[PDB]
Amino acid sequence: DYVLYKDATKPVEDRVADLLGRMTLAEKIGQMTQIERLVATPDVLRDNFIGSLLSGGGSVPRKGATAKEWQDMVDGFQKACMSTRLGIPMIYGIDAVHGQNNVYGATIFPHNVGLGATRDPYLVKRIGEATALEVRATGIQYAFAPCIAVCRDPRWGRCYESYSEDRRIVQSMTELIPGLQGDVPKDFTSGMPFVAGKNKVAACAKHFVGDGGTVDGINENNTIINREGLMNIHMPAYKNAMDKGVSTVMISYSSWNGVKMHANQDLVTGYLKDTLKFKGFVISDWEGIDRITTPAGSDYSYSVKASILAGLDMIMVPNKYQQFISILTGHVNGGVIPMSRIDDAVTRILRVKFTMGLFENPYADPAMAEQLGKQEHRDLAREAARKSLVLLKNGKTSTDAPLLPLPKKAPKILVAGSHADNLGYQCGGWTIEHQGDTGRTTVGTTILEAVKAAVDPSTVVVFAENPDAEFVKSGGFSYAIVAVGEHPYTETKGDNLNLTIPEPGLSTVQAVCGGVRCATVLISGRPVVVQPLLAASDALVAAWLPGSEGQGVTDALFGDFGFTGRLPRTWFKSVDQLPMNVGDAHYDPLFRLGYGLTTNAT
Numbered sequence: 001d002y003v004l005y006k007d008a009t010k011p012v013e014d015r016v017a018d019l020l021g022r023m024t025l026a027e028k029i030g031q032m033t034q035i036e037r038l039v040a041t042p043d044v045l046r047d048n049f050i051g052s053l054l055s056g057g058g059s060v061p062r063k064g065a066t067a068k069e070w071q072d073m074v075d076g077f078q079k080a081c082m083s084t085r086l087g088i089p090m091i092y093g094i095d096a097v098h099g100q101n102n103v104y105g106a107t108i109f110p111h112n113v114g115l116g117a118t119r120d121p122y123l124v125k126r127i128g129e130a131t132a133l134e135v136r137a138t139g140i141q142y143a144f145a146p147c148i149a150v151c152r153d154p155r156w157g158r159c160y161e162s163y164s165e166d167r168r169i170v171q172s173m174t175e176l177i178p179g180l181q182g183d184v185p186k187d188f189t190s191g192m193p194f195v196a197g198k199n200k201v202a203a204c205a206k207h208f209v210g211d212g213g214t215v216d217g218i219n220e221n222n223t224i225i226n227r228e229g230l231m232n233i234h235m236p237a238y239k240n241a242m243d244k245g246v247s248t249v250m251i252s253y254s255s256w257n258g259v260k261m262h263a264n265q266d267l268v269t270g271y272l273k274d275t276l277k278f279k280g281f282v283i284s285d286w287e288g289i290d291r292i293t294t295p296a297g298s299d300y301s302y303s304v305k306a307s308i309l310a311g312l313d314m315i316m317v318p319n320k321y322q323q324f325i326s327i328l329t330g331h332v333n334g335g336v337i338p339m340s341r342i343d344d345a346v347t348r349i350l351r352v353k354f355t356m357g358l359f360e361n362p363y364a365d366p367a368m369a370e371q372l373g374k375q376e377h378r379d380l381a382r383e384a385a386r387k388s389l390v391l392l393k394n395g396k397t398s399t400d401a402p403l404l405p406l407p408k409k410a411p412k413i414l415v416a417g418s419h420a421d422n423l424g425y426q427c428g429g430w431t432i433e434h435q436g437d438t439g440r441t442t443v444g445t446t447i448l449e450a451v452k453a454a455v456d457p458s459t460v461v462v463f464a465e466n467p468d469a470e471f472v473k474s475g476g477f478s479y480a481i482v483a484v485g486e487h488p489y490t491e492t493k494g495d496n497l498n499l500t501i502p503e504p505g506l507s508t509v510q511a512v513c514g515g516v517r518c519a520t521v522l523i524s525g526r527p528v529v530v531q532p533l534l535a536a537s538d539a540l541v542a543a544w545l546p547g548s549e550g551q552g553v554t555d556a557l558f559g560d561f562g563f564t565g566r567l568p569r570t571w572f573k574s575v576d577q578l579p580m581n582v583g584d585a586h587y588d589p590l591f592r593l594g595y596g597l598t599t600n601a602t
């Protein structure tokens, strides 16, 4: 009664081949199918031999669910998968892209653009490590990260998900990979997948390739660039990812010179698989195959053909699984897609699952639940937040006393602005909901809360969200901290051609700073029109989207640590200059890439 694929002491490739040779076509196509938890049930999983589940943004068992609730849900689905004839465990994926960010009480780290500002790849490794633990806390084994897009135009709604417009910084930050997955062995062959075991997660280098190079930063659009520029800007960090054993790669919705990435055999099979020697699995984006056609979904039969022939291995359906499986079965049955292509896809998927230990530990560890939101991880997020901050101005004239660092002891201070006491705004997109949200959406510390935690007990702190000029002038304030910026956004909703922050933002800054010396904290996912904010402000800090730990902001305001962040993108003078990147011929920045003022700790 011995079955070699079930023997944990056997080599991964032997186990993969042993299982593959036993599988029916239905079982094989099943492995290639990923479905939303929203459409999953025990019978669906079992009857269609489903390979994977995901949560999209905001796809949660309920609002406020505990780590245990998540474990029980994942285990519930796994039990059904394990009960099939062959007992192949599913892999469960989620967007844990700045912590385990769909989950209430999870540590929320700074978004990627802020992390680029740190120039600290080891910090990003440690964030990978902590994120893996908080993902495993919820029973999930797979994170759709890192986004290694090189955003070349801040008008893109996902520019905050890119570490930098400079591929060299993005390359350096692929250290997230061995954080999430564990360090690869001494001997390791570049392109093989790796996950250390049950305390780590499979990672996903996304979105292949040129997602950050689209025309006018239009999300999912066309990236017009010759092969030399594709390979010089958008590709390099994928080779770093191969070298670190990234387990999966997700394909972009975007096109390269008119060709849909989800139909690009030359790049997916010819380049990623056959040239970079990637041996993990390739996954679609969410209805990415549907969007090959215009309109999307208008020829699903072609979507399946073109994508699977291009070399994709697993399809993030995520809803219409019966139609996907029916169509792909018909294609194989009619010889339109050869069995060799199906077998390659399934070999890859199994290779990842076996390598990562999923056949040995298919179920959640309840002892891991307490990892969620752990104070050690929050302390790391607080460090990352502080290191991400870029000091742009610290005095209106070169002769003024520097405003920062501010004194913790003062009779009375003002904290103001739409973003001073709003946890959701300081986290941005991909936090609790897909688009992010407003207000107190999870566990954390706002800027107001952090100021109150920081200051001397004799310092009276007044909050006013949008005070008028008289209020400020009459208040007897020593100084003000005023926080304003962008609202949360994700993907296409963030595409923005004007890059001006919503009012009241500027008007509040002008009222506050007109009455008392002020430090302006600008929360944004990218550079935004800033000359008016600068003109009003004594000091101005680009804080990006710093996450749940607002104390990282006050650690630098009040001088516990000096400012060290440096712009990881160009700051433009006007959006009519765009695209404008470091190294261009017409480079006329307000602040060049690398710019950042410093302070010393007090």
Ligand SMILES: OC[C@H]1O[C@@H](S[C@H]2[C@H](O)[C@@H](O)[C@H](O)O[C@@H]2CO)[C@H](O)[C@@H](O)[C@@H]1O
Binding pocket: 055, 056, 057, 095, 144, 206, 285, 286, 434, 491
């Ligand atoms: O979340 C999986 C995958 O999503 C796409 S965008 C995705 C949202 O989570 C989904 O819930 C919503 O209804 O559709 C959108 C796309 O329209 C994303 O590109 C990728 O990074 C992410 O891993």
Ligand SMILES: *[C@@H]1O[C@H](CO)[C@@H](O)[C@H](O)[C@H]1NC(C)=O
Binding pocket: 218, 220, 221, 222, 255, 258
């Ligand atoms: C780019 O966006 C335009 C709308 O501006 C749309 O008509 C076109 O289909 C898009 N192109 C691609 C390749 O996605």
Ligand SMILES: *[C@@H]1O[C@H](CO)[C@@H](O)[C@H](O)[C@H]1NC(C)=O
Binding pocket: 495, 496, 497, 498, 499, 500
């Ligand atoms: C700028 O564009 C955004 C997002 O596309 C829009 O919501 C906002 O109203 C615009 N701002 C201005 C000044 O037109």
